[PDB]
Design a protein around this ligand. Structure first.
Ligand SMILES: N=C(N)c1ccc(/C=N/NC(=O)c2cccnc2)cc1
Ligand SMILES: [Ca+2]
Length: 223
């Protein structure tokens, strides 16, 4: 997260860190056994780390649970990043409490202008490289689909939306991938892609979660 703020320990209780010996992606806990992340975060040997603030220090609220299965969206295209969504099942159910909690799935899509909270442990610099240890947060509006398409000609599908600031300076970034965009208490987006980070006229692009709620529910129901 570039141009954001320190969230505060466990203030984003659905935020997960995906760990394969090190943090490599974010994710969102959607019930006691399932995490939503980006398909581009797919790899084997994932351990899901819940209740994290400082990802380099055991602080007392963590639950570390290995993934038992990963399900990349059937239509994920790694070249276009269309359908950039994946489900991860935990080997055991998380113990849900104030600091480890699921986030509600949307029942309808969000509109341009809605404010959202984007969070993660990704790069904090738009030019250089600095990775934070504690969770960073950014409040950002959803942008109109027309401005999104204008920013990224030929690249925005109906499964994507832009959020952030066309002036630059405030954005998600590398390492935030797979993490949440939460708007009015619903998971509306997943950190997917962008051109650099926090660059002028290049806002963050996010997976449009409301399109996938049907697939998420039925997948969970049979797995
Ligand atoms: N501007 C955003 N909101 C944004 C931009 C990019 C990304 C993702 N980056 N990933 C990388 O660079 C990368 C990751 C692994 C290996 N090699 C390169 C997320 C958000
Ligand atoms: Ca920790």
């Amino acid at each position: 997260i570039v141009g954001g703020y320190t969230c505060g320990a466990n203030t984003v209780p659905y935020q997960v860190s995906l760990n394969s010996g090190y943090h490599f992606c974010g994710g969102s806990l959607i019930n006691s056994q399932w995490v939503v992340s980006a398909a581009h975060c797919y790899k084997s040997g994932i351990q899901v780390r819940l209740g994290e603030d400082n990802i380099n220090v055991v602080e007392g609220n963590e639950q570390f649970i290995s993934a038992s299965k990963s399900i990349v969206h059937p239509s994920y295209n790694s070249n276009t990043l269309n359908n950039d969504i994946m489900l991860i099942k935990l080997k055991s159910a998380a113990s849900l409490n104030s600091r480890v909690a699921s986030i509600s799935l949307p029942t309808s899509c969000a509109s341009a202008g809605t404010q959202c909270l984007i969070s993660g442990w990704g790069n904090t610099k738009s030019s250089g490289t600095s990775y934070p240890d504690v969770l960073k947060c950014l409040k950002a509006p959803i942008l109109s689909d027309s401005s999104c398409k204008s920013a990224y000609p030929g690249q925005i599908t109906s499964n994507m939306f832009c959020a952030g600031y066309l002036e630059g300076g405030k954005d998600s970034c590398q390492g935030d991938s797979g993490g949440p965009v939460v708007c009015s208490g619903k998971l509306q987006g997943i950190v997917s892609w962008g051109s650099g980070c926090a660059q002028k006229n290049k806002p963050g692009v996010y997976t449009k979660v409301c399109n996938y709620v049907s697939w998420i529910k039925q997948t969970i129901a049979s797995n």
